[model samples]
Structures are given as C-alpha cells and as structure tokens.
Target: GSSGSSGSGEKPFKCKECGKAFRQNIHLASHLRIHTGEKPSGPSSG
Candidate 1:
C-alpha cells in the first residue's frame, strides 16, 4: 500500500524511511518529525 495511491490526487503522509507518500496531512506531520529529529517539548522549552 505504501507504493502510493492512484485513486485520489491527495497525499497524506510521506515516509522518510522509504520516500512513500500518504493521504493525510496529520500523518505527514507526525512522520516528518522522524526525519527532522524533533523531540517532545521540554519543561523550559514549553
């Protein structure tokens, strides 16, 4: 399924591991952090 969707013109997530694209923005945002190396907020940073 990670080969990408052909039914819709929308992409949700993009896998940083394999360059796969998804159909949800939330999924894209969540997965992007894996590539960005972003961690949870800290006490001082929050």
Candidate 2:
C-alpha cells in the first residue's frame, strides 16, 4: 500500500515526524526548523 497526493479538489494535507502540523506545501519549509535544521541533503550541492 502507498499514500499519494491526488490532483485538484485540495484536501487537508498534513504530515508529522513526532508532533507538528503543516497546511500547505510552502508551509513545510518554515515549520521544519526542529525537524532537521529546516534543511535537507548536504553541502549546497545537487
């Protein structure tokens, strides 16, 4: 089984690591401060 984000008809999009909430794709960027330095991967590289 797998969870996926369907198109259109926006619904309550949410995800949490331990205990925190976000409402939008743009919101996750700011709410992830304690989730992991609010950044991912390593070294400003691609």
Candidate 3:
C-alpha cells in the first residue's frame, strides 16, 4: 500500500489521533502510543 509522496510530500501512514504522517507503519504505531497513553513494557528488573 505504498503511495507517492506528492503534493507537499505527505507520507502514506497517518495517525488517527494526530495528523502526523510517518513513512513506515511501525513509526506510526509507536507514535500512536503517545496519544493512547500506553507505555511500552520492558524486561523485568527482578
């Protein structure tokens, strides 16, 4: 689902919460976490 970056060079992947555009899907997904108030989990320190 790749589209040419034309007419102001807009990226294909876009965030629903914000109008920010990302070149890759992963980048967009990561940004969505900010609006959703979800923090990524890390390895247990224990």
lDDT scores in order: 0.66, 0.58, 0.80
TM-scores, all candidates, are 0.37, 0.29, 0.56
How good is model 2 by TM-score?
Answer: 0.29
List candidate 2 stretches off by more than 4 Å. Answer: 1-11, 37-46
Clashing pairs in 1: 12-22, 12-23, 12-24, 13-22
Clash tally, candidates in order:
4, 0, 0
Worst 10 residues of 1 by lDDT: 5-14
Give the worst 10-residue stretch by lDDT in candidate 3: 37-46
Quote the lDDT for 40 in model 1: 77
Model 3 spans with C-alpha error above 4 angstroms: 1-9, 38-46
Assess candidate 2 and give its lDDT. Answer: 0.58
The CA lDDT at 20 in model 3 is 87
lDDT of 1 by residue, 1-46 (tens): 5697666434556676757576777777777666764567645757
The digit string of per-residue lDDT tens for model 2 on 1-46 reads 5977675343354446653455786676666655666555667786
Relative to the unseen true structure, what is the Cα RMSD of model 2?
9.7
Q: Output the number of the lDDT-best candidate.
A: 3
